[PDB]
Amino acid sequence: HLDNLNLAQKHLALMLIPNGMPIKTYSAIKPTKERNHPIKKIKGVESGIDFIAPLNTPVYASADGIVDFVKTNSNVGYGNLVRIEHAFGFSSIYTHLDHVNVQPKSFIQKGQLIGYSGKSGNSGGEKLHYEVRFLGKILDAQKFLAWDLDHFQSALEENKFIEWKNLFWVLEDIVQLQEHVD
Amino acid sequence: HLDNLNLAQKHLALMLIPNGMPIKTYSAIKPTKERNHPIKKIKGVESGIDFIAPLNTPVYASADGIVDFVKTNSNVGYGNLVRIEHAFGFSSIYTHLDHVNVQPKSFIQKGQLIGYSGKSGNSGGEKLHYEVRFLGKILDAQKFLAWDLDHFQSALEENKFIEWKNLFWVLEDIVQLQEHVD
Numbered sequence: 326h327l328d329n330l331n332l333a334q335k336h337l338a339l340m341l342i343p344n345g346m347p348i349k350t351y352s353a354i355k356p357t358k359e360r361n362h363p364i365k366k367i368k369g370v371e372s373g374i375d376f377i378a379p380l381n382t383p384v385y386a387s388a389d390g391i392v393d394f395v396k397t398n399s400n401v402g403y404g405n406l407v408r409i410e411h412a413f414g415f416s417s418i419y420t421h422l423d424h425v426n427v428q429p430k431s432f433i434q435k436g437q438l439i440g441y442s443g444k445s446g447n448s449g450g451e452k453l454h455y456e457v458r459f460l461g462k463i464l465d466a467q468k469f470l471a472w473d474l475d476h477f478q479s480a481l482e483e484n485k486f487i488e489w490k491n492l493f494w495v496l497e498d499i500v501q502l503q504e505h506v507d
Numbered sequence: 508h509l510d511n512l513n514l515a516q517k518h519l520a521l522m523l524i525p526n527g528m529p530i531k532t533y534s535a536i537k538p539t540k541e542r543n544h545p546i547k548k549i550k551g552v553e554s555g556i557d558f559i560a561p562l563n564t565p566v567y568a569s570a571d572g573i574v575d576f577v578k579t580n581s582n583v584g585y586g587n588l589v590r591i592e593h594a595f596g597f598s599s600i601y602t603h604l605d606h607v608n609v610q611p612k613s614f615i616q617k618g619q620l621i622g623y624s625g626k627s628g629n630s631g632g633e634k635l636h637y638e639v640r641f642l643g644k645i646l647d648a649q650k651f652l653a654w655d656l657d658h659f660q661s662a663l664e665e666n667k668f669i670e671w672k673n674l675f676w677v678l679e680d681i682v683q684l685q686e687h688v689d
Contacts, residue, residue: 332688333685333688333689336684336685336688337681337684337685340680340681340684341594389677389680389681390594390595391595391596391642393596393642410592410596411594412523412572412593412594412595413572413573413594413614414573414575414592414612429642430596430641430642430668430669430670431670431673432595432670432673432674432676432677433677434676434677434680459612460573460575460611460612486612487612488612488613488614491613491614492614494614494616495571495614495615495616498522498571498616499519499522499571500685502518502519502522503515503518503519503682503685504689506514506515506518507515507686507689
């Protein structure tokens with residue numbers, strides 16, 4: 326069934342689950358594993374990815390959801406940050422920000438501006454730190470960056486801890502309900 | 508706009524956000540405020556509702572989501588329980604269960620069986636304890652019990668802490684995308 330998903334299922338998944346790039350301009354992308362981790366201060370921690378980008382680069386939500394946590398005047402650890410809760414257990418986090426433009430409890434639309442990149446906290450310089458998690462579990466963010474309508478299998482290969490078939494069964498019942506209402 | 512929502516928005520909201528009764532058979536419904544709270548052991552705690560029902564009554568998910576936490580062999584506090592995370596910050600919890608039939612990380616469909624009612628923990632007898640929350644904040648569960656297609660304003664009157672207009676703007680963009688794909 327993961328090979329024969331319909332377009333309605335694909336479009337719905339890409340509104341609800343993080344996908345694509347959260348920033349339009351960057352000079353480099355590097356895993357956080359390869360620098361001193363913002364909290365643990367050692368290399369080798371599986372912890373998402375950093376977009377090397379100049380101060381004040383706009384940062385955009387990677388899927389619909391709700392803001393559940395922000396830090397707006399912090400210069401320690403992750404620094405200023407936004408965490409977005411998405412459907413079906415996914416979350417995305419955006420850190421080291423210069424400025425935060427959304428409030429906790431605010432509903433979020435995919436592509437909405439949520440802040441401006443900075444160097445706050447233990448950043449190692451001007452960059453956006455980005456993580457995608459599933460019930461708090463760290464995932465390979467690159468698989469979600471590369472996920473789009475023309476590359477739909479990308480995120481589905483993050484399959485060890487996520488039961489994608491069962492998620493798409495749930496989404497099929499949502500798409501069928503709207504076809505019945507058309 | 509909350510008066511002129513289309514049917515596609517209404518149907519989508521009722522798949523994603525808790526609504527209706529999580530149990531088919533009960534003798535009484537009473538707020539948990541009116542009994543000794545499972546944890547605090549005093550009256551007057553705003554804490555959801557209890558369905559007075561006999562042991563082994565099946566318990567059903569009130570919306571689509573993901574199981575984020577279970578207790579399966581507990582006889583203290585809330586007892587055996589399932590917590591379901593829904594989209595847009597909502598959660599539902601089902602407690603005092605005799606048996607739990609879902610695992611953490613499992614995707615859930617609205618109406619799916621999730622366990623069997625019991626008297627586990629500080630239950631005060633055979634009952635299902637049920638709570639609906641928004642980013643961890645307790646809500647008036649009766650407003651979600653009474654919410655359905657023919658009574659669509661019911662949950663929308665829980666309006667003090669939830670920006671329903673903004674939520675429905677987000678849902679409108681999902682419904683428009685599927686109309687464009689039809």
